[PDB]
Nucleic acid binder design. Structure first.
Lengths: 75, 97, 109, 95, 227, 83, 95, 109, 97, 83, 227
DNA sequence: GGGGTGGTCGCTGTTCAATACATGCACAGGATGTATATATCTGACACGTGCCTGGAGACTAGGGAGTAATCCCCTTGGCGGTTAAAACGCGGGGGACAGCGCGTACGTGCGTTTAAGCGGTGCTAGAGCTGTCTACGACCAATTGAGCGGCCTCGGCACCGGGATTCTCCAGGGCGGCCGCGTATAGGGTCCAGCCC
DNA sequence: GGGCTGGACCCTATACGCGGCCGCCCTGGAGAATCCCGGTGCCGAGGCCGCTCAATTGGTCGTAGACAGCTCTAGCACCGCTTAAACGCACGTACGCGCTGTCCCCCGCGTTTTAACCGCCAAGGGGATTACTCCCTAGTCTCCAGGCACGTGTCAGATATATACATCCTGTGCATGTATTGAACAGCGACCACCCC
């Protein structure tokens, strides 16, 4: 079962914190490496990223929607 | 709610229809008028055999069908499905026309 | 006392007219002279090609449950054979239509 | 009446009756077959004429016809046409 | 309604140098589309005669064939050591091609590459490749033939690489499936629902789309064995 | 007596049918004008040669044989109208 | 001892000295120009021959040559070649 | 006894050989008969085309500061012209090279 | 650090060089050897004129150059700049080869 | 005497030069084998026609005229070799 | 070094029906590449003679051209009221084309759609379009000619749309620039750094790539005025 | 006995679990379009007949090609130096390509308009067929000069080395926008003074 | 007399602006490449020379086609009526394309290998030329039968309608992952009771 995808997304974005945030492809790779079936949950990940953006927990660097790179909030 | 096929289904069924049949697709009498206009742009008061106009129409439709085949291949090469004038121009230029 | 007139087609075992082929070669302005065996060879080749196309067209007509060969059947026979298609690559068959062929990328998922 | 218009229709029909006894042919298909026969005749005769001109020969012979057939017809079609022509020529020569 | 091909002599003993004839009777009119094949043991058949009278390329003039309509014959004049083999007629005038029972005579470059023996348990599936070389791949159909000591040779079906066209013997519909690969010039045969009955040697054979053309070159054969 | 705009008689549905026989599933809106131009060029090229043959024969009627000769010269041999 | 071989080289050279008096030509360019002249001669002659056959005429005339020129040469090439041929024939008829 | 020979090219005002063209037409199997004006017309057309190509090739040679026309100059003259390129579209010229042409999308910026 | 041109600059310079020049680009002796190899399959004991091999080489190079031009057009059509085997196949098929 | 694997004599830099003359800027690594195959097909066709002409002439030497005739009949007329 | 054309009769007076001869001399040998033009007042010039002897299309046999080398002449045999116009010889045997001074005579479907008159101020620039129809656009050059009331006709340059090749008179380099659009069959001429001296009527003219062809069809002419 | 502290109880807040909701996937049913079947009836294929012209039969006349001899050219073959090109490897830049998101262009469907198709009639322009006669072209013999092979020689150009200009790539200096900290400001807490209970 | 509230003051919290830092663009400098120019030799163009064979002059014979006359076919025009197709509009979905990010695949540049090129010599196979000569094919007259045009009849199939199956689209039901709210537990505060001084 495991935790909701939001927890894994936050862990992946906090895993290395490049000067510019993690990209969608890189975070999917991180989720796959940690262990997740990214193949059948792409919509779940995209909606999770959109949710975390709307709550303000994450900030979007360049792209829009699921595109671009994502880094953690100000604090 | 009225029935409605999704885009491309009727297109594919039309493709299967017209690739099965052999009749001419362009209207006979408008094509004849076009032929006569072009001809009078070369020599006035020309007359045409019915079979001559029929041969011209057969040749024109065969040429257009083959050109659309080449255009479709070019469009698919561009990873598209819609044929475009740039695809037609590429096909014609490669054909050496 | 002339012997009963045979025909050169019958002598060669052919159906196509050797005499007519020889006449066409003579009057076609192909050379000053024409050999005796040339129209026989040419008639044999023409008959062979005609037999091959008519055979394939008749098979196609039978597959379409038709007893009479039509330009559609000639077109199918020619286009479904690579060698005949190469021979007639630049030829347009009237009322022949086209082979049914849809690109795989266009078909639905 | 009118001036006689010679065509290959009867010979094409005899060949048809040899290859498929019970089937017939439409007039449009017969016209297409006549066009085919005329086109192939013109191709072979023109190629043989070119060969004779190249070799400074005044006579088109079965050798010229055979070489023209090999040049024009592809592969197995050419091989079978050559076999048919050779068999016919030998039978004709043997009366 | 399949045309059964009847070879009269099922076996023949002959001395050297003397003449030998082999007779074939067709069930129905095949209209001169008959071929003759020579198969030495544990090797693939080589074609001898096609169109019932025409020598295959490289065949010596000692072999000769005749006949038309329903009754055909094969003749060998100068019997030499290598002539001891099994001779099969093949008719291809109708869509299901049929081989003869086979006459065992005993006396006193186009390359088709085919896979090696296969051992498979029943119910599983096997895929035999056919790598063709030495000729233009698309111009010739590839024909598949199954040989069993109990039932002889059977024509399974063919693939036309030019347009991927297929035709199958009704006995092998579903059982056999043929595919081609223009890029690698390779043909594959797929068998589904394997059974002990499928333990046989499968030959890929090349045949031109010309109707009088016969099976000219053969693969070495894949000996599939079902446990 | 005169004719000035008849290429528009090659209608959009007619071009669509030609494309469908050609295997085309989706058609841009400019294909129709582009195809009309291409067809007009092809017809001009063929008809010029046909009229040239007619004028050489001193005829005032363009014949099917004239069209066949024009096509054969342009490398587009047409079967079914000879004789 | 060698065998005489005909070529258009001297006529091409005369025309070259008319159009550019001070310009020369290399052997490869002369060979290409000979090939060109032969090719165009063959095309025009073949088209005129086919015209004569189509019209059941046994004679190739300057009218057949004119029609063949109109068929083979595009636009202004055809117009100016026809003008040159007509001028030459008119001069020859009176000379 | 006999008038001094005057050539047919000279009568027509042509450099190309009318007599040679007439003989080639007679021996080329083109027709049973050849009219008197046919070789004159054909020689005039051939001379016109030759003069046109040599004129353009000489202009190209002058632009290169070369005195002798070379196959490169012939290729440049033919390919730079709509009508000559149309006439010779299927012709390969030995040692002619190709026109300088780079597609704009390949250029920097 | 030593001088180093950026990718495509030397490519453009080579394009300009070889479109300006006219010499044959394939090596004479291996092309002759290939011609003899291919011919050996059709008839044994053949000899070749030097001019015959030269004509074959000019024809082959011209054919290849024209095919590469069509391939470049196809690549640009696909919005790429790298020519690919599918580009060659498209050009050949549209040419009718 | 026997020559066995000579297609590889059409080296990669030679193919790159041919592409550069063709105006090609960037070349995928798979181009070279495809080009060699295409060249082999073209050579086979032309040489087969040339050898047919040579055999008809009953000669053992393939001539430039034989090559030129083969090229012409395949629609690839070549100027400059005695045509 | 530009070849100078010298029309000796500047003005001629003649009644109806009689004959008028106009002659031209060349500084260098132009080798028969001379043409004659008729220009009505405020009308575009129409061609009469090309290759110094050939009548232009639709021109009656009343007009006769003569001469070669450096001496040329134009002859009119049966004068009409319409023949009152100004006639110019044009040489096109060398890169800078040159028109004659002009001769005034007084007696007692290819379309080149050129734009309307333009008013402009110095220093700025104008772009003059040429829309051509009724012929194959790429097969013919478009020639541009400037006609002042003081300097007569001057040849500016041409663009050849098949390869966009251009050639300019050295007097007009930089001042003039030519572009073409195949999709619209339109040619544009842009004048830079306009000056009151640039106040003249500019004509677009079609000319085939054939060397003996002349400027045959002309646009109606766009006058450009600089304050 | 009073004050302080601790203990217990109650109330509130937090966390956890349960329930309801949003999202997506799979199966079923209905609509519809192509397909499959006879029935019918119109006409196109196929067969008979008669006539005539083109193919067969027999002969003449000669010349085109096959066949043999000879020469000598030009193709093949081995050889050995000289580099120029091919080959191999390596660092890295940019280009292919995969994923996503948005806008609108194109597909599907329906009501209205238009003109294509048919069929039927009338007329004449011209295709095409025949007969005459003759201008023009094929064929042969005599003549000769234009064109081809040979020889030569000398000037255009290929090659080369040395400057020149232009182009191509990187580095250094001036400039804009964003973020963290500093400064000013405002709000809340606090202490004293006055008023009310 | 005490507590509550209001006024004045001080402490903390908040909002905006400025300097420093990261990213960007423009201009100058260096070097490599392409050009360009003058010198030099070398071999191919092009000019002359003699011979020979094919082009020209002249003449004969006949026939291909220009032309004129007549027939009668089919192409052109026109008109009415039916109805299918084109057109125009609405609307919605999926496809083109633009953006972002990743990764790895060619590109550019060295050094090492190799084999191509070129000059050289030597050998002989076969191409080309010439001569003889005879087998085959063109040209011609006669004769008859194979093929083409006309005519006629009838069966394969085109068209029509009725039913059948396969496919296409979507509605709904289930699964599942997530968010919200309610309840339960624990911690803190307040009040009472008990213990200590």
């Amino acid at each position: 079962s495991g935790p909701p995808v939001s927890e894994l997304i936050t862990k992946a974005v906090a895993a290395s914190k490049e000067r510019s945030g993690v990209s969608l492809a890189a975070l999917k790779k991180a989720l796959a490496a940690a262990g997740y079936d990214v193949e059948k949950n792409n919509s779940r990940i995209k909606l999770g990223l959109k949710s975390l953006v709307s709550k303000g927990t994450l900030v979007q660097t360049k792209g829009t929607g699921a595109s671009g790179s994502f880094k953690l909030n100000k604090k | 709610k009225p029935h409605r096929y999704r885009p491309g289904t009727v297109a594919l069924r039309e493709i299967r229809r017209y690739q099965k049949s052999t009749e001419l697709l362009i209207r006979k009498l408008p094509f004849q008028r076009l032929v006569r206009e072009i001809a009078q742009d070369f020599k006035t008061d020309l007359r045409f055999q019915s079979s001559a106009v029929m041969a011209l129409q057969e040749a024109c439709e065969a040429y257009l069908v083959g050109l659309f085949e080449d255009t479709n291949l070019c469009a698919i090469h561009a990873k598209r499905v819609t044929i475009m004038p740039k695809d037609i121009q590429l096909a014609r230029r490669i054909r050496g026309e | 006392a002339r012997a009963k007139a045979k025909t050169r087609s019958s002598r060669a075992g052919l159906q196509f007219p050797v005499g007519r082929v020889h006449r066409l070669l003579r009057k076609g302005n192909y050379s000053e002279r024409v050999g005796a065996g040339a129209p026989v060879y040419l008639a044999a080749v023409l008959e062979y090609l005609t037999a091959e196309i008519l055979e394939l067209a008749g098979n196609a007509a039978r597959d379409n449950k038709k007893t009479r060969i039509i330009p559609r059947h000639l077109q199918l026979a020619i286009r479904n054979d690579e060698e005949l298609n190469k021979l007639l690559g630049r030829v347009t068959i009237a009322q022949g239509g086209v082979l049914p062929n849809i690109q795989a990328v266009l078909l639905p998922k | 009446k009118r001036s006689r218009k010679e065509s290959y229709s009867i010979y094409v029909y005899k060949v048809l009756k040899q290859v498929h006894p019970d089937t017939g042919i439409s007039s449009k298909a017969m016209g297409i077959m006549n066009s085919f026969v005329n086109d192939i005749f013109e191709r072979i005769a023109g190629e043989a004429s070119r060969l004779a001109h190249y070799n400074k020969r005044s006579t088109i012979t079965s050798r010229e016809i055979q070489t023209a057939v090999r040049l024009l017809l592809p592969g197995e079609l050419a091989k079978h046409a050559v076999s048919e022509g050779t068999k016919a020529v030998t039978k004709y020569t043997s009366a | 309604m399949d045309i059964k091909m009847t070879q009269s002599p099922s076996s023949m003993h002959a001395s050297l140098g003397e003449r030998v004839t082999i007779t074939c009777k067709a069930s129905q009119d095949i209209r001169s589309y008959l071929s003759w094949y020579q198969q030495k043991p544990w090797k693939s058949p080589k074609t001898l005669i096609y169109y019932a009278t025409s020598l295959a390329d490289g065949v010596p003039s000692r072999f000769s064939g005749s006949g038309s309509g329903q009754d055909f014959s094969l003749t060998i004049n100068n019997l030499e050591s290598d002539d001891t083999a099994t001779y099969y007629c093949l008719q291809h005038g109708e869509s299901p091609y049929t081989f003869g029972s086979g006459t065992k005579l005993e006396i006193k470059e186009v390359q088709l590459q085919q896979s090696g023996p296969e051992l498979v348990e029943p119910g599983t599936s096997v895929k035999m490749p056919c790598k063709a070389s030495g000729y233009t791949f698309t111009s010739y159909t590839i024909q598949w033939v199954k040989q069993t000591p109990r039932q002889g040779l059977e024509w399974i079906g063919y693939i036309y690489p030019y347009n991927a066209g297929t035709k199958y013997n009704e006995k092998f519909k579903g059982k056999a499936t043929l595919t081609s690969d223009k890029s690698s010039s390779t043909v594959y045969m797929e068998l589904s629902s394997l059974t002990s009955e499928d333990s046989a040697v499968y030959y890929c054979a090349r045949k031109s789309s010309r109707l009088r053309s016969t099976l000219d070159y053969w693969g070495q054969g894949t000996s599939v064995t079902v446990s | 007596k005169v004719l000035r705009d008849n290429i528009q008689g090659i209608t959009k549905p007619a071009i669509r049918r030609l494309a469908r026989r050609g295997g085309v599933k989706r058609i841009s809106g400019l294909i129709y004008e582009e195809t009309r131009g291409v067809l007009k060029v092809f017809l001009e090229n063929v008809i010029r040669d046909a009229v040239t043959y007619t004028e050489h024969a001193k005829r005032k009627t363009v014949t099917a044989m004239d069209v066949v000769y024009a096509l054969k010269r342009q490398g587009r041999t047409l079967y079914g109208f000879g004789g």
